[PDB]
Design a protein around this ligand. Structure first.
Ligand SMILES: [Zn+2]
Ligand SMILES: [Zn+2]
Ligand SMILES: [Zn+2]
Ligand SMILES: [Zn+2]
Lengths: 149, 149, 149, 149
């Protein structure tokens, strides 16, 4: 991927893989922030990871994992089956809208020393303001051209 | 998982997943740091993420993804097929040893503004030093008892 | 200073600088975290920095600045005039108790986009939890020998 | 200060304080990054803090302290004696030009486990790239109007 030509926020299919018995696994680039222009702080990124794990699964089947990028500009989404980015775009948009306006502290799973490996590094405040910032730019179903929604 | 009773560094099989056509996937908790005692800085975590993606693929097949935890105490690793924590521990130990000694700056893939979403946030110094710190503690095949390899 | 042999949390006087006309300025190392064993996440550190600035001024005059170390293990405190490392200890301890016990979000100053240069990177959750952790280890008045206030 | 309308990078005199014997201390806002649009990662910020400490002293007298902002968009600079925002801008510009081109790993002070409280969290690569990015935008002598030197 040439990171200098994409336009975030976008949803991008990274790859599809076929297992031996023929199951398909799709990998998605969920870019929340424009590469090299900004990066999410660890606390909000961490809280958004916990929330997205929950919210996505309420909205769609087949989620294997949703882990953040080391570069902190988004999330790697792994799913069973072919998926297509417009459905994924709507799942992410809807989830972000819930984080922006709906989630309270008690809806954030795993914020104790027993259930999380860095439980101090959380921030609902950061997650809500990031979600709002990301939503205000529109979620595009294409990475190279703006196609919001 | 009770993060208070584990002993890091460890490799722990999280789950095996069967897809619709019977294909097996395995998810691994690659725990490099004791939960809630410390956390990797973003720069070294990011460089390690890049190097692991390359080093793991050189040593084993069927890697689907290896993404850092939002808590910054390790990596979530996903593979095709049944795998068991013993061979994964070896692959991880061997990769960390190469980071610790062998690797130079030109061996780190994706450190340019075109190839990476946050290309400034890298540190080979950090990656090397973290690698050696983790190695010095030993990599266990069990999360609850020290069984180093 | 040899960071390997200090015992944190501690307060340490670093130096007294004398002005051109004889005013004295004192520098303090406020070490909240054991060097190289851990480090505070940016959001907690940022929130604590906002709170400390206000809370310290409620308790003592002559504060010139209280800035976070680049290493994220504590704060640099600059004060007008000669000052006692023991009274500094009480002022910090008293401040941490309030963050731990009696601070709400509305009591954190400068948490808006107009008033702070990274207003999303805040966490009262992190600040409160770190303050509790620090207080429970005790604040020493000496860097090399546990002398808790 | 209204952070929404400043135009970074800039140098801004925050305040002068007088001591009982008539000594002047000047405080500066060294804003390297546009508030709320981006933030320096900890490693780059940490390495720059170590370098700015020596580089500034080689160029001007009276430096009391140069500490990072908790918001990670710049540095707080404290000096003996009367200001000169234009002269301060020149020193900062000159120091950044040195970081971008003249500094090697061995030129960074405090990068061992004895001499630094988080010695793994350093990155010459990050410091150099940030220094280049900042210089490409120009250092203004006025926070509100671009007067780049
Ligand atoms: Zn967590
Ligand atoms: Zn990257
Ligand atoms: Zn702030
Ligand atoms: Zn340092």
């Amino acid at each position: 991927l040439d990171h200098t030509i994409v336009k975030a926020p976008y949803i991008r299919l990274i790859s599809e893989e076929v297992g031996p018995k023929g199951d398909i696994i799709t990998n998605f680039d969920i870019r929340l922030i424009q590469p090299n222009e900004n990066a999410m702080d660890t606390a909000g990124l961490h809280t958004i990871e916990h929330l997205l794990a929950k919210l996505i699964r309420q909205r769609i089947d087949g989620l294997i994992d949703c882990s953040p990028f080391g570069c902190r500009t988004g999330f790697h989404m792994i799913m069973w089956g072919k998926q297509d980015s417009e459905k994924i775009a709507q799942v992410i948009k809807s989830s972000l809208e819930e984080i922006a306006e709906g989630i309270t502290w008690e809806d954030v799973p795993g914020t104790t020393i027993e259930s999380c490996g860095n439980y101090k590094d959380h921030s609902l405040h950061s997650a809500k303001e990031w979600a709002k910032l990301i939503l205000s730019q529109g979620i595009s179903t294409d990475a190279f051209e703006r196609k919001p929604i």
